[PDB]
Design a protein around this ligand. Structure first.
Ligand SMILES: CN(C)[C@@](C)(c1ccc(F)cc1)c1cnc(N2CCN(c3ncnn4cc(-c5cnn(C)c5)cc34)CC2)nc1
Length: 280
């Protein structure tokens, strides 16, 4: 007589419905063979992003897009996620309208800032990197508090907008807890297809390594092959990235514990980074 409420089973909430012909589409923000995200103007909702599938997409991607709409509808608003603003469902393919983040993804932002960075006007600083790590931890703590896992946390899925605010995007693989980004995945996810709050924490560790290397690719010179899998399973881990303070590398190392039970929670990570910020 007692059941979990699965957000993907709930009905669409028509409060999100927006007239389709009041969108005016602009530049491409992301694209693949079966879908794209475009900038648009939305009369009566301002600048927004619109996620949509291409006519070649199969029914599985279409179901996945509606599921993502339903997860975002359930989660509610948070400063550190790219929030749902509206949807178009009647008489056409699903359009998911989200917030537009004017500075794009953090991976590309960090990479173009390498010549304008001090590791301590218009410069990226260590204070900014600490802030970004704090905000992403706050956003992931929010997801976990709603029993949600993201499953593709990476610097490429963190966007930057005004006020130096970072926002987690792309909830297409996000799941409620009752082809794959292998180098960001926890070993139990690779080996046993198991995803948990603790495997999101592993990915956050990889994200921190990206952050404090200003966007370097993880495990450089190590292709995904049988040798990569054995080395991760037997305990190989990346070294401290070049700009990480010792306290942040300590967080990374615990995020990468082979035992999920020994990894920190996002709530614990938030409180850790909070103490580091106050010490500054
Ligand atoms: C990977 N998948 C396979 C797809 C293709 C997909 C899957 C299913 C679909 F049905 C449709 C598409 C995909 C999903 N997601 C995204 N990204 C793109 C970035 N995007 C943004 N969202 C809000 N604002 N914003 C501002 C900027 C910005 C500002 N300056 N510059 C230079 C860029 C970028 C964004 C968030 C999501 N791209 C591709």
């Amino acid at each position: 007589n007692y059941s979990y409420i699965d957000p993907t089973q709930l009905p669409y909430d028509h409060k999100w419905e927006f007239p389709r012909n009041r969108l005016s589409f602009g530049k491409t923000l992301g694209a693949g063979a079966f879908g794209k995200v475009v900038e648009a103007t939305a009369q009566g909702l301002m600048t927004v992003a619109v996620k949509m599938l291409k006519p070649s997409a199969h029914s599985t991607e279409r179901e996945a897009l509606m599921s993502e709409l339903k997860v975002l509808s359930y989660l509610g608003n948070h400063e550190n996620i790219v929030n749902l603003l509206g949807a178009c469902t009647h008489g056409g393919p699903t359009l998911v309208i989200t917030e537009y983040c004017c500075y794009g993804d953090l991976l590309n932002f960090l990479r173009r800032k390498r010549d304008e960075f001090v590791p301590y006007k218009d410069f990226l600083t260590l204070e900014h990197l600490l802030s970004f790590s704090y905000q992403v931890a706050k956003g992931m703590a929010f997801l976990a508090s709603k029993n949600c896992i993201h499953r593709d946390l990476a610097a490429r899925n963190i966007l930057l907008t005004h006020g130096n605010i970072t926002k987690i995007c792309d909830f297409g693989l996000a799941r409620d807890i009752k082809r794959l980004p292998v180098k960001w995945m926890a070993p139990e996810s690779i080996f046993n297809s198991v995803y948990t709050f603790e495997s999101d924490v592993w990915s956050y560790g990889i994200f921190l390594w990206e952050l404090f290397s200003l966007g370097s690719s993880p495990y450089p010179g190590m292709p995904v092959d049988s040798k990569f899998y054995k080395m991760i399973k037997e305990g190989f881990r990346m070294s401290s990235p070049e700009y990480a303070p010792a306290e942040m590398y300590d967080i990374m190392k615990t995020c990468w514990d082979a035992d999920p039970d020994k990894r920190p929670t996002f709530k614990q990570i938030v409180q850790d980074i909070e103490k580091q910020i106050s010490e500054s």
